[PDB]
């Protein structure tokens, strides 16, 4: 579904093809066959550009379209607090938040 242009953001009519072809390539197939093939899922997207272009809107929209959990977020340099060790404890906290769920519910 590509009402994105009319969803509320103009953007471009070319990105979505690449984005969701890669996403489908990654996550559509059943876990067992993907494991057997031993291919690695895509984990990581880079966005950049001048402000005021709707990057946050694009992020929310893409997060909503995919059937995933409510998106969790963090600040830009607040991660670098005036302390040595916070940059470890807080980051480990953020990752452990989902690690606990993965352990509980399993693979």
């Amino acid at each position: 579904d590509w009402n994105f242009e009319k969803m509320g953001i103009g953007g471009l009519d070319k990105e979505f093809s690449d984005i969701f072809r890669r996403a489908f390539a990654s996550r559509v197939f059943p876990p067992e066959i993907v494991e057997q093939m031993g291919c690695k899922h895509v984990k990581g997207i880079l966005l950049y550009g001048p402000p005021g272009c709707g990057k946050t809107l694009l992020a929310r929209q893409i997060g909503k379209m995919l059937n995933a959990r409510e998106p969790k977020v963090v600040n830009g340099p607040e991660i670098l607090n005036k302390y040595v060790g916070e940059s470890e404890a807080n980051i480990r906290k953020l990752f452990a938040d989902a690690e606990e769920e993965q352990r509980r519910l399993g693979a």
């Binding site: 302390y83 040595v84 060790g85 916070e86 404890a89």
Partner: peptide, 24 residues
């Protein structure tokens, strides 16, 4: 160091409680 100060805060709370039990 943050965990240390947090543990010491817990310790001071416990100390208050115990001195709040021994006095009465």
């Amino acid at each position: 160091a943050l965990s240390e100060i947090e543990t010491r805060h817990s310790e001071i709370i416990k100390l208050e409680n115990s001195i709040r039990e021994l006095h009465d």
